[PDB]
């Protein structure tokens, strides 16, 4: 999680898409969905990002519809956005034990207990937090098994990006859980 505000320049694809669904949260606008192989993924937009501005207009107090409407009517050549990096999220670095454990239990993406004497306990991992990213890879909508897999095949350092459940459940309401599994960019960034 970067310590503040950056500008991205976006370009609609040939079909006039950018790859983005946005959600109104506490009078800001937040990234609910980044589509894989979209202009939004290429420029590095992330789940939970805050959009401060769209072409120099502040988003404060916009509806999800107005934000989507503004994106439709943009002069597609060049959309600029002002972005605050995943402000509802934190990153925890843990190290696996020789048994390959970081030392917690999760269910539908949500940490539910921390195991005594673990790297998770030592690093103050919290329950009632949804897993957003593992090693900078988005994992929202993946099955618990596939998250297990990404943890199993991770190296010994595991970086987890988490979000309080109440905030997570506010962001993903009105997005059917198959679109999350199917269409949320789950890939490693390109260079």
Curated annotation (Swiss-Prot):
Name used for this protein in its record: Syntenin-1
Primary location recorded for the protein, binned into one broad class: other
Positions of a 1,2-diacyl-sn-glycero-3-phospho-(1D-myo-inositol-4,5-bisphosphate) binding: 108, 143-144
Entry keyword Secreted: yes
Gene: SDCBP
Membrane topology: Peripheral membrane protein
Effect on the protein upon substituting residue 107 to A: Disruption of the cooperative binding of C-terminal peptides from FZD7 and phosphatidylinositol-4,5-bisphosphate
Known role: Multifunctional adapter protein involved in diverse array of functions including trafficking of transmembrane proteins, neuro and immunomodulation, exosome biogenesis, and tumorigenesis. Positively regulates TGFB1-mediated SMAD2/3 activation and TGFB1-induced epithelial-to-mesenchymal transition (EMT) and cell migration in various cell types. May increase TGFB1 signaling by enhancing cell-surface expression of TGFR1 by preventing the interaction between TGFR1 and CAV1 and subsequent CAV1-dependent internalization and degradation of TGFR1.
Tissues where the protein occurs: Expressed in lung cancers, including adenocarcinoma, squamous cell carcinoma and small-cell carcinoma (at protein level). Widely expressed. Expressed in fetal kidney, liver, lung and brain. In adult highest expression in heart and placenta.
Description of post-translational modifications: Phosphorylated on tyrosine residues.
GO MF: cytoskeletal anchor activity; frizzled binding; identical protein binding; interleukin-5 receptor binding; phosphatidylinositol-4,5-bisphosphate binding; protein heterodimerization activity; protein sequestering activity; syndecan binding
Boundaries of every PDZ domain copy: 7-86, 91-166
Subcellular location: Cell junction, Focal adhesion; Cell junction, Adherens junction; Cell membrane; Endoplasmic reticulum membrane
Keywords attached to this entry: Acetylation, Cell junction, Cell membrane, Cytoplasm, Cytoskeleton, Endoplasmic reticulum, Lipid-binding, Membrane, Nucleus, Phosphoprotein, Repeat, Secreted
Subunit structure comment from the entry: Monomer and homodimer. Interacts with SDC1, SDC2, SDC3, SDC4, NRXN2, EPHA7, EPHB1, NF2 isoform 1, TGFA and IL5RA. Interacts with NFASC and PTPRJ. Interacts with SDCBP2. Interacts with PDCD6IP. Forms a complex with PDCD6IP and SDC2. Interacts (via C-terminus) with TGFBR1. Binds to FZD7; this interaction is increased by inositol trisphosphate (IP3). Interacts with SMO.
Result when mutating residue 143 to A: Disruption of the cooperative binding of C-terminal peptides from FZD7 and phosphatidylinositol-4,5-bisphosphate
Induction or repression: By IFNG/IFN-gamma in melanoma cells.
Native source species: Homo sapiens (Human)
Gene Ontology biological process terms, A to Z: actin cytoskeleton organization; chemical synaptic transmission; intracellular signal transduction; negative regulation of receptor internalization; negative regulation of transcription by RNA polymerase II; positive regulation of cell growth; positive regulation of cell migration; positive regulation of cell population proliferation
Positions spanned in the full protein: 108 to 298 of 298
Cellular component terms per the entry's GO annotation: adherens junction; azurophil granule lumen; blood microparticle; cytoplasm; cytoskeleton; cytosol; endoplasmic reticulum membrane; extracellular exosome
